[PDB]
Design an enzyme around this catalytic site. Structure first.
Site, PDB file in Angstrom:
ATOM      1  N   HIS E  89       0.832  -1.206   0.000  1.00  0.00           N
ATOM      2  CA  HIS E  89       0.000   0.000   0.000  1.00  0.00           C
ATOM      3  C   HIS E  89       0.877   1.271   0.000  1.00  0.00           C
ATOM      4  O   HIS E  89       0.417   2.365   0.332  1.00  0.00           O
ATOM      5  CB  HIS E  89      -0.996  -0.001   1.176  1.00  0.00           C
ATOM      6  CG  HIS E  89      -1.759  -1.288   1.320  1.00  0.00           C
ATOM      7  ND1 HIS E  89      -1.348  -2.268   2.189  1.00  0.00           N
ATOM      8  CD2 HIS E  89      -2.789  -1.759   0.573  1.00  0.00           C
ATOM      9  CE1 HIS E  89      -2.117  -3.309   1.950  1.00  0.00           C
ATOM     10  NE2 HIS E  89      -3.005  -3.052   0.979  1.00  0.00           N
TER      11      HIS E  89
HETATM   12  C1  LIG Z   1     -11.324 -16.547   8.170  1.00  0.00           C
HETATM   13  C2  LIG Z   1     -11.902 -15.630   7.163  1.00  0.00           C
HETATM   14  C3  LIG Z   1     -11.573 -14.331   7.014  1.00  0.00           C
HETATM   15  C4  LIG Z   1     -10.559 -13.640   7.867  1.00  0.00           C
HETATM   16  C5  LIG Z   1     -12.226 -13.543   5.976  1.00  0.00           C
HETATM   17  C6  LIG Z   1     -11.879 -12.289   5.657  1.00  0.00           C
HETATM   18  C7  LIG Z   1     -12.537 -11.537   4.628  1.00  0.00           C
HETATM   19  C8  LIG Z   1     -12.319 -10.238   4.447  1.00  0.00           C
HETATM   20  C9  LIG Z   1     -12.968  -9.414   3.389  1.00  0.00           C
HETATM   21  O1  LIG Z   1     -14.030 -10.116   2.727  1.00  0.00           O
HETATM   22  C10 LIG Z   1     -15.312  -9.860   3.287  1.00  0.00           C
HETATM   23  C11 LIG Z   1     -11.918  -9.027   2.318  1.00  0.00           C
HETATM   24  C12 LIG Z   1     -11.473 -10.238   1.514  1.00  0.00           C
HETATM   25  C13 LIG Z   1     -12.524  -7.933   1.424  1.00  0.00           C
HETATM   26  O2  LIG Z   1     -12.671  -6.757   2.248  1.00  0.00           O
HETATM   27  C14 LIG Z   1     -13.992  -6.239   2.281  1.00  0.00           C
HETATM   28  C15 LIG Z   1     -11.664  -7.588   0.192  1.00  0.00           C
HETATM   29  C16 LIG Z   1     -12.349  -6.465  -0.586  1.00  0.00           C
HETATM   30  C17 LIG Z   1     -10.232  -7.210   0.587  1.00  0.00           C
HETATM   31  C18 LIG Z   1      -9.503  -6.666  -0.615  1.00  0.00           C
HETATM   32  C19 LIG Z   1      -8.009  -6.560  -0.530  1.00  0.00           C
HETATM   33  O3  LIG Z   1      -7.446  -7.657  -1.160  1.00  0.00           O
HETATM   34  C20 LIG Z   1      -6.073  -7.735  -1.231  1.00  0.00           C
HETATM   35  C21 LIG Z   1      -5.579  -8.878  -1.900  1.00  0.00           C
HETATM   36  O4  LIG Z   1      -6.503  -9.787  -2.381  1.00  0.00           O
HETATM   37  C22 LIG Z   1      -4.184  -9.021  -2.042  1.00  0.00           C
HETATM   38  O5  LIG Z   1      -3.790 -10.160  -2.717  1.00  0.00           O
HETATM   39  C23 LIG Z   1      -2.385 -10.378  -2.852  1.00  0.00           C
HETATM   40  C24 LIG Z   1      -3.301  -8.057  -1.531  1.00  0.00           C
HETATM   41  C25 LIG Z   1      -3.814  -6.935  -0.863  1.00  0.00           C
HETATM   42  O6  LIG Z   1      -3.014  -5.943  -0.344  1.00  0.00           O
HETATM   43  C26 LIG Z   1      -1.702  -5.823  -0.907  1.00  0.00           C
HETATM   44  C27 LIG Z   1      -5.214  -6.750  -0.696  1.00  0.00           C
HETATM   45  C28 LIG Z   1      -5.794  -5.581   0.002  1.00  0.00           C
HETATM   46  O7  LIG Z   1      -5.102  -4.682   0.505  1.00  0.00           O
HETATM   47  C29 LIG Z   1      -7.272  -5.555   0.043  1.00  0.00           C
HETATM   48  C30 LIG Z   1      -7.912  -4.394   0.709  1.00  0.00           C
HETATM   49  S1  FES Z   2       1.880  -0.454   3.247  1.00  0.00           S
HETATM   50 FE1  FES Z   2       0.142  -1.809   3.581  1.00  0.00          FE
HETATM   51  S2  FES Z   2       1.285  -3.532   4.250  1.00  0.00           S
HETATM   52 FE2  FES Z   2       3.017  -2.182   3.940  1.00  0.00          FE
END
Ligand SMILES: C/C=C(C)/C=C/C=C/[C@H](OC)[C@@H](C)[C@@H](OC)[C@@H](C)CCc1oc2c(O)c(OC)cc(OC)c2c(=O)c1C
Ligand code: FES
Ligand SMILES: CCCCCCCCCCCCCCCCCC(=O)OC[C@H](COP(=O)(O)OCCN)OC(=O)CCCCCCCCCCCCC
Ligand code: HEM
Ligand code: HEM
Ligand SMILES: OC[C@H]1O[C@@](CO)(O[C@H]2O[C@H](CO)[C@@H](O)[C@H](O)[C@H]2O)[C@@H](O)[C@@H]1O
Lengths: 199, 107, 330, 127, 123, 74, 50
Positions: E89
Site C-alpha cells: 500500500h
Molecule cells: C477466516 C476468514 C476471514 C478472515 C475472511 C476475511 C474476509 C475479508 C474481506 O471479505 C469480506 C476481504 C477479503 C474484502 O474486504 C472487504 C476484500 C475487498 C479485501 C480486498 C483486498 O485484497 C487484497 C488482496 O486480495 C491481495 O492479494 C495479494 C493483496 C492486498 O493488499 C496488498 C489486498 C488488500 O489490501 C485488500 C484491501
Molecule cells: S503499506 Fe500496507 S502492508 Fe506495507
C-alpha cells in the site's frame, strides 16, 4: 516507476504454438530438452517434471529409460537398515543440481536459481520474456549504470541487474538433428521446452 | 582527570607518503577514543570515533586503531591535503579530555 | 492443505489428475465469472430500483451474499499457497488488527500462530469448504424474499396486469444466456486460462519476500483502491468496509416517486458516471501508489460514496419536481 | 541538514561574564543527544567545558563547574554558555557541538559550531 | 533464538534472516548512512524516534521486516527516503527503518538482540 | 552460420531510425563520460544514466526483429 | 520432550535430557549437513533409524 525498474517490454515473437489451433513443435521441445540438460541443468532444477511425461512428447520410452538410469536415487534400505542407491526410473522426477537451498546459493554468489518447471507461467511475458532475457545480454551496461559486483546487465529484467550471466553462445551444443545451434535457436528451443514443462 | 599524550608532538612530513600519530591515556579508556581534525581556518570536524569507526565524509585512507591505553591514527597519504592539527579525546568517564594535538606540515 | 504440500497438490491436480487442469481452470475462471455476473446483477438492481420497497429485505440478503462470496473467494485463493496467496492472506487477516484494543489478538487467533503458517492454510481450506454451503442457504433466503413479491420489471411499474409462466418462456430464455455464459467461460478455460490471474501465484509462498509486482485479484481492485486512498490505517479499513455497507442506504436515499431509471434523464447519466467510476477505481488499484493516481483514486473514492449519499437523493428530488412542473400548470 | 550557528560578544572585561549562544537548526534540542561547549586555548589545546542533555540535565567539567551555567531555550531551539568572573585564563575560541550517543560506540561530537574567538581584555568595544 | 555472522556482511549490504516465522532485517550501514539516520528532525516523523534509541551499534541496523500497516515485507534499498519501500500500500521507511510516508503508523519494530564476538543473537 | 537475431539487429541499427536512436544514445554516453571525469562525481546523488536512450533504441529494434526472427529459425 | 515438564520432571531436567541426544539441524552456509543437541520442542528419539 522508471523504465529501468519496470524492465524493457518483451516483444512478440511468432511462436508456432501461439494461436487457438496450434500445438507445440515437438522437435523444438526435444532440442530444448538437450539445451536444458547441457546448459541450464547445472544451476536449474526441474522438480515438477517426471521422466515418464517426456515419453511420447519428445523422446521414446527407451530413450527416457536410458536418461533416467544415468542418475542415482535413494532406494529403500537393505535388510540391515543401511542406506542404498538405485538407478532412476520412469516414475522418478528429473533431479536437480543441488541438494539444498544453501548449496544452491553457495554456488551462485548468494543467489538462488529458481526451479524452471513453471517459469513460463510464473513470469509476465511468458515465452517472449524468457526468450528476450536469454538473448538480451548486451556486452556492456548502458553508460552511467553502476552494476553491483557479481551482477549482470539485462534490460528485460526488472531493475536491470540480474545474478544470472549470459549462458548461451553460438554452437555450444551439437544438435542431434543437424540444426545450427545459434544463440537465438537455442533460446527458442529451450523456451519451447520450458513452456511444455509448465503446460 | 584522564590525560592523553599525543606523539609525535606536531611533526612535519612529506606529501608522497604516510604518517602515524598516537595517543596514550593515563588510564584504560576501553576503545572509547575519538579523533578530530582542526583545519588551519579554524574549522574542526570529527574524523574517527570509537577507535576505528569512520565518520561520514572522511576518506577511506584514514585508519585508526588500538586498545587498552594505546591508540593510533594511520593515514595512507597526505595527497591532496590533510594539513591540519589532529586531536584525540576519550569518553569512558567524565570529564572528557583531549590530547595535546599534532600539527601536520610539509617537509 | 498442509502448508508444505498445498502448492504442489494443486500442481498435482494440473499434471496428474485426469482432466484436473479442466477442473482447476473452470474453478479459477469460474470465480472471476461469478464476480462479473454478480456485478452485473447488482448493477441491474441499482438501475431498475430493485432495492426499493417492497424488496428491501431481498436487497439486504443480497448484500450479505456479496460479502460471503468475496470472503469465500479470498479463502480459496489462499489455498493455492502461491506468492499472492501468502501475502493476500497476511494483509487481509491483518485488516482486523485495526480493531482497537483486541485487534492483534484477533489476528493471532485467525493465524493460529506467529504468522500465516500451516495452522492458517489448513483452517482456511476447511472454511473455504464450508462458506459455499452457507451461501447456498442464503440464496434460498434470497429466493424466498423474491417469491413473495415477484420480480420487478424494466418499466418500474406493477407487473400484476400481465404475467406469463416461468415455464417454457423464461426457462428457455434463461437457457440462451446459460449457453452464452458457458461459451465465453470455455473460451477462457481452454484458450486463455491464466489471463484473469497473476503470474506470481505460480511461485510458492515465501514468508520472507513480498514481490514488488503484488496486485490483488481483479474483482477486489476497486475496494483495494478505496482502502489505499486513505493515508490512515484504521480509517482506510473502515472506509473500505463502508464501501460495501453503503449499499444498504439506497432504499432510503432514493427519494424518487418512481421506481427505476428508465424514464429519468439525470439518474441515467449519473448511473453511468457511477459505473465508469467503479471501473476507474479498479484501474487505479492496478496501478502503483504514484502521482497522479493517488489524487485520482481519492476523487473517485469520494464520487463512489457521493453517489449514494448525495447524488441520488439530490437528483431524485430534482427529478420529482421536474416531472411535476413539466405538465401541471397554474 | 543539521547546523550549529554561534553568536555572542567575543570580547569581555575581566571579572565579568561571558555569554555565548548556539542556534541549532535541522534538529530539535529536546529530541535527543547532548549539546556541548568546548574551548580552544591560544596554545592550540582543546578542553571540554560541559553540556546540557536533551532532557535538560547538566554535566560540567569540575575544572569550571563552580563558574559555568549552561542553559537552553526550547522555543528558539538554542542553548547557551555563561562563564562567570572571567580571567585572561579564559581567553580562547569557544565552540558548541552536538554529541551523539550509542550504547556500543559511546559519545562523539559530530556537528560543530563555527566557533567564536573570545578575548578577555580591558579594551572598549562599541556594543 | 537465531545467530548471524556479522563478519560475512559487507558494507552497504542488506541481509534477511528468519526468526520465529518473521523476516529480520540486518544492514551494515555506511558512515554516510549513519549520519543520515541521526540527522533528521523529529518534527518530520509520525512516529518520532532517535536512531540511537533504535540501534545499539550505529553500524548495524537490526529490525523486523514487517510493515506496520498490514504485514507485508518492505523491499530493501527502495522508496523515496533511502531505506525500504512496502509494495502493498506504499509505505516508505528511512535508513533507520522509521516510517516516513504511507498508511503504516509505526517505525519497523526492533527485536531484542545481543552481540557476541563477530555475530549477533536475535531473540 | 552467425546468430540470426544479431544479424537482424545489426541490419536495423543501420536504418534511418536506427541511426538516429544510436546517435541519441551515443550522445548521452559521451555526456556521461564527461560527468564522470569531473571532480567529486561519487558525491552527486543525481547522476545521469543512459538507460532511457538505450531502451528507445532496443524497443525500436525489437519492434522490427520480433516479427521477422522466427522465419529465420528452425 | 516439553510434555514431561510439570508432569514428571522440571524444565531444567528435561532440557538436560533432551540435550543428551543429537538431531538434524539446518545445513550450514555451504549446504553441508550438521547436527545439534535436542531441545524441548523435539520428540523423544527412537533406538532405530528405520
Ligand atoms: C477466516 C476468514 C476471514 C478472515 C475472511 C476475511 C474476509 C475479508 C474481506 O471479505 C469480506 C476481504 C477479503 C474484502 O474486504 C472487504 C476484500 C475487498 C479485501 C480486498 C483486498 O485484497 C487484497 C488482496 O486480495 C491481495 O492479494 C495479494 C493483496 C492486498 O493488499 C496488498 C489486498 C488488500 O489490501 C485488500 C484491501
Ligand atoms: S503499506 Fe500496507 S502492508 Fe506495507
Ligand atoms: C459494491 C459494488 C457496487 C456495484 C458495482 C457496479 C458494477 C459495475 C457495473 C458492472 C458492469 C455492468 C454494466 C451496467 C449494467 C447496465 C444496467 C442496466 O440495467 O442497463 C439498462 C440499460 C437500458 O435499459 P432501458 O430499460 O432503460 O432501455 C429502455 C428501453 N425503452 O442498458 C443500457 O443502457 C446499455 C448497457 C451499456 C453497458 C455498459 C457497459 C460498461 C461496463 C464496463 C465493464 C468493463 C470492465 C473492464
Ligand atoms: C539456457 C539455460 C538456462 C535457462 C533457460 C535459464 C533461465 C532462467 C530464468 C528464466 C531465470 C529467472 C529470471 C527471473 O527471475 O525473471 C533465471 C535465473 C537465474 N539463473 Fe538461469 N537459466 C539457464 C542457465 C543458468 C545457468 C547455467 C546458471 C548457473 C551458472 C544460471 C543461474 C541463474 C541465477 C543465479 C538466476 C537468478 C537471477 C536473479 O534472480 O537475479 N542459469 N534463469
Ligand atoms: C449467489 C448470488 C446470487 C444469486 C444466486 C441470486 C439470484 C437471484 C435470482 C434468481 C433473482 C431473480 C432473477 C433476476 O432478477 O436476476 C434475483 C433477484 C434479485 N437479486 Fe439476486 N442473487 C444473488 C446475489 C445478489 C446480490 C449480491 C444482490 C444485491 C447486492 C442481489 C439482489 C437482487 C435483487 C434486488 C433482485 C430483484 C431484481 C428485480 O426483480 O428487480 N442478488 N437474484
Ligand atoms: O558476475 C558477472 C561478472 O561479469 C562481468 C565481467 O566484466 O560482467 C560483464 O559480463 C556480464 C555477462 O553477460 C554482463 O552481464 C555484464 O554487463 C558485463 O559487464 C562483471 O562486471 C560481472 O560482475
Amino acid at each position: 516507476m522508471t523504465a529501468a525498474e519496470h524492465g524493457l517490454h518483451a516483444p512478440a515473437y511468432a511462436w508456432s504454438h501461439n494461436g487457438p489451433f496450434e500445438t507445440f513443435d515437438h522437435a523444438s521441445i526435444r532440442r530444448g530438452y538437450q539445451v536444458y540438460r547441457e546448459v541450464c541443468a547445472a544451476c536449474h532444477s526441474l522438480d515438477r517434471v517426471a521422466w515418464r511425461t517426456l515419453v511420447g512428447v519428445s523422446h521414446t520410452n527407451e530413450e527416457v529409460r536410458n536418461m533416467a538410469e544415468e542418475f542415482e536415487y535413494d532406494d529403500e534400505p537393505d535388510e540391515q537398515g543401511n542406506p542404498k542407491k538405485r538407478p532412476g526410473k520412469l516414475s522418478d522426477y528429473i533431479p536437480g543440481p543441488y541438494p539444498n537451498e544453501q548449496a544452491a546459493r553457495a554456488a551462485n554468489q548468494g543467489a538462488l536459481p529458481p526451479d524452471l518447471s513453471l517459469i513460463v507461467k510464473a513470469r509476465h511475458g511468458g515465452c517472449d520474456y524468457i526468450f528476450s532475457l536469454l538473448t538480451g545480454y548486451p556486452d556492456e551496461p548502458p553508460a552511467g549504470v553502476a552494476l553491483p559486483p557479481g551482477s549482470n546487465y539485462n534490460p528485460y529484467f526488472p531493475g536491470g541487474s540480474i545474478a544470472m550471466a549470459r549462458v548461451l553462445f553460438d554452437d555450444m551444443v551439437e544438435y542431434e538433428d543437424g540444426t545450427p545451434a545459434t544463440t537465438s535457436q537455442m533460446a527458442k528451443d529451450v523456451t519451447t521446452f520450458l513452456n511444455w514443462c509448465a503446460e | 582527570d584522564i590525560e592523553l599524550t599525543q606523539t609525535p608532538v606536531s611533526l612535519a612530513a612529506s606529501l608522497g607518503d604516510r604518517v602515524t600519530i598516537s595517543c596514550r591515556a593515563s588510564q584504560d579508556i576501553n576503545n572509547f577514543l575519538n579523533w578530530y581534525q582542526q583545519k588551519p581556518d579554524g574549522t574542526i570536524k570529527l574524523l574517527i570515533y570509537y577507535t576505528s569507526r569512520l565518520h561520514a565524509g572522511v576518506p577511506s585512507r584514514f585508519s585508526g586503531s588500538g586498545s587498552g591505553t594505546d591508540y593510533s591514527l594511520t593515514i595512507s597519504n597526505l595527497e591532496p591535503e590533510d594539513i591540519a592539527t589532529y586531536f584525540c579525546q576519550h569518553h569512558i568517564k567524565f570529564p572528557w579530555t583531549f590530547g595535546a594535538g599534532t600539527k601536520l606540515e610539509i617537509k | 492443505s498442509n502448508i508444505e504440500l498445498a502448492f504442489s497438490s494443486v500442481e498435482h491436480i494440473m499434471r496428474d489428475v485426469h482432466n484436473g487442469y479442466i477442473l482447476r481452470y473452470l474453478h479459477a475462471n469460474g470465480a472471476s465469472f461469478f464476480f462479473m455476473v454478480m456485478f452485473m446483477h447488482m448493477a441491474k438492481g441499482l438501475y431498475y430500483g430493485s432495492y426499493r420497497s417492497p424488496r428491501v429485505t431481498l436487497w439486504n440478503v443480497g448484500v450479505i451474499i456479496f460479502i460471503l462470496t468475496i470472503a469465500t473467494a479470498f479463502l480459496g485463493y489462499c489455498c493455492v499457497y502461491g506468492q499472492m496467496s501468502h501475502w493476500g492472506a497476511t494483509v487481509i487477516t491483518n485488516l482486523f488488527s485495526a480493531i482497537p484494543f483486541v485487534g492483534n489478538d484477533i489476528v493471532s487467533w485467525l493465524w493460529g500462530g506467529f504468522s500465516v503458517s500451516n495452522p492458517t492454510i489448513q483452517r482456511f481450506f476447511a472454511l473455504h469448504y464450508l462458506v459455499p454451503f452457507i451461501i447456498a442457504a442464503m440464496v434460498i433466503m434470497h429466493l424466498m424474499a423474491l417469491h413473495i413479491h415477484g420480480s420487478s420489471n424494466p418499466l418500474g411499474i406493477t407487473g400484476n396486469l400481465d404475467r406469463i409462466p416461468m415455464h417454457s418462456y423464461f426457462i428457455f430464455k434463461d437457457l440462451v444466456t446459460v449457453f452464452l455464459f458457458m461459451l465465453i467461460l470455455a473460451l477462457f478455460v481452454f484458450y486463455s486460462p491464466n489471463t484473469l490471474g497473476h503470474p506470481d501465484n505460480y511461485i510458492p509462498g515465501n514468508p520472507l519476500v513480498t514481490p514488488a509486482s503484488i496486485v490483488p485479484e481483479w474483482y477486489l481492485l476497486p475496494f483495494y483502491a478505496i482502502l489505499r486512498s486513505i493515508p490512515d490505517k484504521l480509517l482506510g479499513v473502515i472506509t473500505m468496509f463502508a464501501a460495501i455497507l453503503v449499499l444498504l442506504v439506497l432504499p432510503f436515499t432514493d427519494r424518487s416517486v418512481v421506481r427505476g431509471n428508465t424514464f429519468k434523464v439525470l439518474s441515467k447519466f449519473f448511473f453511468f458516471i457511477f459505473v465508469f467510476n467503479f471501473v476507474l477505481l479498479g484501474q487505479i488499484g492496478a496501478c502503483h501508489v504514484e502521482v497522479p493516481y493517488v489524487l485520482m483514486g481519492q476523487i473517485a473514492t469520494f464520487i463512489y460514496f457521493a453517489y449514494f449519499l448525495i447524488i441520488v437523493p439530490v437528483i431524485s428530488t430534482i427529478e420529482n419536481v421536474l416531472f411535476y412542473i413539466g405538465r401541471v400548470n397554474k | 541538514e543539521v547546523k550549529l550557528q554561534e553568536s555572542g560578544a567575543g570580547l569581555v572585561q575581566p571579572s565579568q561574564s561571558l555569554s555565548l549562544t548556539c542556534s541549532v537548526t535541522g534538529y530539535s534540542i529536546t529530541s535527543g543527544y547532548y549539546w556541548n561547549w568546548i574551548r580552544l586555548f591560544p596554545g592550540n589545546k582543546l578542553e571540554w567545558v560541559g553540556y546540557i542533555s536533551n532532557v535538560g540535565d547538566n554535566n560540567y567539567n569540575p575544572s569550571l563547574k563552580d563558574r559555568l551555567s549552561i542553559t537552553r531555550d526550547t522555543s528558539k531551539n538554542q542553548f547557551f554558555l555563561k562563564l562567570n568572573s572571567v580571567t585572561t585564563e579564559d581567553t580562547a575560541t569557544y565552540y558548541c557541538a552536538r554529541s551523539e550517543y550509542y550504547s556500543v560506540t559511546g559519545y562523539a561530537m559530530d556537528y560543530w559550531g563555527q566557533g567564536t574567538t573570545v578575548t578577555v581584555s580591558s579594551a572598549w568595544r562599541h556594543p | 533464538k537465531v545467530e548471524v555472522n556479522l563478519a560475512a556482511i559487507p558494507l552497504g549490504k542488506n541481509v534477511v534472516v528468519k526468526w520465529q516465522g518473521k523476516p529480520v532485517f540486518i544492514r551494515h550501514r555506511t558512515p554516510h548512512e549513519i549520519q543520515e539516520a541521526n540527522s533528521v528532525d523529529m518534527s518530520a516523523l509520525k512516529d518520532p524516534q532517535t536512531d540511537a534509541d533504535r540501534v545499539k551499534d550505529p553500524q548495524w541496523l537490526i529490525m523486523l521486516g514487517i510493515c506496520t500497516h498490514l504485514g507485508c515485507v518492505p523491499i530493501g534499498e527502495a522508496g523515496d527516503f533511502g531505506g525500504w519501500f512496502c509494495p502493498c500500500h506504499g509505505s516508505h521507511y528511512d535508513i533507520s527503518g522509521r516510517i516516513r510516508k504511507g498508511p503504516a503508523p509505526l517505525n519497523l519494530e526492533i527485536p531484542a538482540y545481543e552481540f557476541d564476538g563477530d555475530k549477533v543473537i536475535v531473540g | 552460420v552467425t546468430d540470426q537475431l544479431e544479424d537482424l539487429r545489426e541490419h536495423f541499427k543501420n536504418t534511418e531510425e536506427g541511426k538516429a536512436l544510436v546517435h541519441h544514445y551515443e550522445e548521452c554516453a559521451e555526456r556521461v563520460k564527461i560527468q564522470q571525469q569531473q571532480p567529486g562525481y561519487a558525491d552527486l546523488e543525481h547522476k545521469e544514466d543512459c538507460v532511457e536512450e538505450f531502451f528507445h533504441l532496443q524497443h525500436y529494434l525489437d519492434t522490427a526483429t520480433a516479427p521477422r526472427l522466427f522465419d529465420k529459425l528452425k
